[model samples]
Target: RPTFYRQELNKTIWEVPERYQNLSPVGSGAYGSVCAAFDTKTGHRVAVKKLSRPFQSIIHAKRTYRELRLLKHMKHENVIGLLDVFTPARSLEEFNDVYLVTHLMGADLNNIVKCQKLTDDHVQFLIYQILRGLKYIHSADIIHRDLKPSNLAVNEDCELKILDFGLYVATRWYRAPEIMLNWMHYNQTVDIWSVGCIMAELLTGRTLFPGTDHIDQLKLILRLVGTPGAELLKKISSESARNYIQSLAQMPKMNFANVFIGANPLAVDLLEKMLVLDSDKRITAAQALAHAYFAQYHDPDDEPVADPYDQSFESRDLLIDEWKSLTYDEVISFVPPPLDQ
Candidate 1:
């Protein structure tokens, strides 16, 4: 027997349940709407997300399922955790809207970087946390295809949690070289490259590669890092992409310290390692975690505990009922382990 939940709406404002009171719209985009609501059951503030027509397209449907599966599977303190999932409709035939419950955050790093004057310590701590989160995510064989200031959630304490795992392209400014060059395939290093771009932005308060388009983005990268070698170009899967690289005049490489004018020498060094032109040579999340840049703030005890659950998802397209069944199964069978003593 299946249990059905009723839809509770506060006028046309929100579609959340009665228990999640004080509903107020906080953000909205193609993904859907987000609201700040008070959870009566937990007596805590939570962020509720209403996914935008997940079943509108197969691509959207797959992304929705992927995001949910990954969120439920990952439990690191630095990675955003899924609290609860609900559908307001009474039965499967009427089910359409989907809602996600997550921890309420103060502001995104994008706003923080613009509004606050960050000190050296602040930059180091924030970058360390990002790497810590990346270490956990990469260890799970997941590439957070998107990593940017806006995607990172932070509290007043400066504590950070990586969020928004929907299958989407990384902002051009934070995109990796391998992705731009059309390399046949890539790995976790793609994310490390994005982290480097973010660190540069935090230091300079401006986008490192503010390209108007894809070609310009690559050109900007070349101007800073210099042209790739024959050996490196050999890895490009697209011939036109390779020829485009060959045709461009060689650029003089700029020193990392010179670009990050006032940053610490060690910090600049770490940035260079992370922003390598070649993904194969890029510093890994684990390596970045152990770098001397984080020596003063890195705590051995603060390492993110790996979530041991399997994260694999089915490849075939699922019917609406099948999707509903899978999602409900996850909610019902989930029994969070006891907290660490």
Candidate 2:
């Protein structure tokens, strides 16, 4: 039976289905509100995200579409699972709200990085899962684009799942140098840069680049890695950006040992590779997986090789009619297909 209810919670009346019981708001942000609830049908704890005016802008619509499409098609143990998609509206005319149900984990890496005292074992496995997830994502020719502690879901068991792929992503601290410099085009290496930031934070228990603004963010990066060559600077198309980078006073490179104190040498080496100044020179996720840092734990068979799924999105500049059709297609796919014809 399809569940429906019009109940009151926290001085607000909620009109939602009865399938989810014991609903309580767990978190809220600019995107929407998230609630933890029991899936009465499956008897499993789950998280339900209600997008805030998802169709209000083209960018929002595109992000909502990509996130849904990727979640629906991608299947990996390290990737977050998309359990269901529902909206209160019965037709397109009133279809403004969107809800996504996913497996609820214990805490985000943001909370974990801040609160928990992670051991070397914790750090290794956490970074391992991240690369493992990236291996799967990159295998499909999809760049996570946004990889940060907040986007990584973790549990007490130390299991990690990558989540939150939207146009507007990553806090400035974890933003890649290529992205920060406004490079015309970037690829998977950007995700590797973020992994380095996350790994560094996991080790030191602090944000590597806690910049107040974009300029300061670049300054922080240069302070650690030192300035890049003019040859590389010429690649940047923006004149002002190029001037800004050129004008910055040179700083000596810092040793990773002094930076990530008490970290394993092999681990530090891998971190340095991921956090390169030039995106081109940065280590790839697959390469990072095979690094000696993870040699003890790395398994060739466990690595992701390919994703046999057609994972593509409608153009970002889709019209309202196209958006509606795409949304419909996404909603329909939520219902699993028959095993045999």
Candidate 3:
């Protein structure tokens, strides 16, 4: 029993079923799309992700299932909540399309990068949230394989949520030093490397590992972080991996710390630890969480951070200027005034 729902393009805008009204298209993906919609019954705003069932190849499908399982093991403010899941009903009377319903987020981290050059403090703030989220996931033996700006959402309140669990595949990125060396079990360090890449992207407003193909991806990674060392290769179970590393003439680890002139030093410190070539020696999320970068912005009382929605057009440039000044304070006084609120 499967319900079928198909969408056909009409004019410039795609038409959603009458069953879904007042929904705005926000983003799209390979096998699906995301929309912000209003619920008539509850009068609530929600994010709806329409996905094709069995989106990836069968081998990769299992990993998606595993990622869903991993979600159950993770719970944090910085992580997106999977509100509900809908599968196609068997009968033609029902819809064949699958849907994932979740809370609506107001902004994306990419927007932040586009607006202003991220200072070290901005990098620290973002890194803190990413580290905190990953720490919990890693502790549960979960790895977020694909960590990038597009997958991150920031609410009107400036709250961060790590999203898109479907793309996380456990084969290599999350592999531990031993796994890269052919170790049977690698753990959650794969996420740490991703976090480092994310940090670099935030600072540079570009992808750290911009690879056009598989070999390019490897070189991009090898260029920024060093080539995996011998100790890391000790776990290589296959001859191919050993040959792959050796083939590079021992490609030296690239130091990303020196790449950004204005990037935050604290973030740089954490990045160096994360982008370690030796998987065995890479910094743990728990350890990185304690690094000074996160503590620098610590809210000891656990109070919520200030919302950036208060920013105004006239003062937006000023706030950006303050950020450029490399000082910790923003031009908060010029924030837009409330409309008699």
Candidate 4:
């Protein structure tokens, strides 16, 4: 029988199964009214996010489905894992609710970074986690697409995990030069650019390039990375994109050494490699992991690779009703993998 137990905890109704007990409100935001609970069966603390009504919205359903698809197969410690996903209403007509039970962690990096000063080891392991996770994510032929301090959750041990997968709104600050240049096709190099921006922010207590709009975003990028050279401009596939570069005033690149005078030279070199204007020149995640900056922490044996993700499901657009049916199908059919040790 399909589980459909209901309870009025805190006077707010919840439609989850009985295995989850002690449901207490942890937080709430645009995503979902998040709450904490423990699995009486598995005896592990779990965090739950009750997805807002996906049945009524196509974008919501699509995002939720894609996130679930990625999280279900993602088993690396660097990336967050899904414990379980269920909805009380199992049928297509009745399907509306989605509860994502994910492994619990302490406050996100945004909260931790602001309060505590990160030492060299802190920065080393933290960046290692990002590249380590990226190795698995990219090997699966998927771009994290969105990466920032806020999206990464951490614990007392300083271990980190990826949070939102299929979203990007405030990610404008981490947008790559190619993205701002209106490149139609993107590769994993786009993610490398964001990593560079994030690493720079970690070193300094401020965002590397805090651009307000697309005009300023490019202006700031050009100012920092310096004006795009003729060779780099010729690499752009679009005429209008090349024209945009021509339109911008010439600016010389700032020396990473001068900008990050306090940082270790190895760290500065890695940042320079990651922040390159040419995607071809940007350090790949595998190469970034092997950089001298992380030589002490790099361990290929510990890094796990995942097979390519099956994204065929997202190839064709479907009607809202069809999406609802498919979404319901996945919710009921999914089997959460064994939690990693």
The best candidate by lDDT is: 4
* lDDT tens digits by residue: candidate 2, 1-341: 26677666545445567889888877545324777889887788888777656777776677677667777866777888788888777777777767788888888888787787788888899899999989988888887777888889887787889997343223788889888857575888889999999899888888899888998998998899888776677678888887888787768778888988888888899988998887778898888899988877799888866556565455347765566657766876687422231
Question: What is the C-alpha lDDT profile of model 1 across 1-341, one tens digit per residue?
Answer: 22432443443334566778777777445224777888777788988887777666666666667767887777877889887777766665676666788889888888788887688898899999999998899888888878888889889898999997243223888989778756467888999989999888888888888887889999999998989887787788787888898899988778988888878999899988988887889999888888999998777677775766465555576775677556655545555433332
Ranking by lDDT: 4, 2, 1, 3
Worst 10 residues of 1 by lDDT: 1-10
How many steric overlaps are in each model, in order? 0, 0, 20, 0
Global CA lDDT computed for model 4: 0.80
Give per-residue CA lDDT, model 4, range 1-341, as digits (tens).
44556777544678888888888777445335677888776888888877666666777777767767877778888998878888787467777778888878888776666777677778888999999999989998988767877788888888888777333235878888888857575689899999888888778867788888987888888888899888887778898777878887799999999998889898899999999998878889998888989988998788888877898977867777777777677777787686555
Question: How far off is model 2, as Cα RMSD?
Answer: 3.4
How much lDDT does each candidate structure score?
0.78, 0.79, 0.58, 0.80
lDDT of 3 by residue, 72-131 (tens): 333567777655444444332343334555678876666677676776766777778777
CA RMSD of all predictions: 3.2, 3.4, 15.0, 2.3
Task: Identify the runs in model 2 with alpha carbons over 4 angstroms from their true place.
Answer: 8-16, 28-31, 165-170, 305-316, 336-341
Candidate 2: residue pairs that collide? none
Model 1 alpha-carbon drift over 4 Å, by segment = 1-15, 28-31, 89-94, 165-170, 181-183, 308-311, 336-341
Q: Please tell me which model should have the higher lDDT, number 1 or number 4.
A: 4
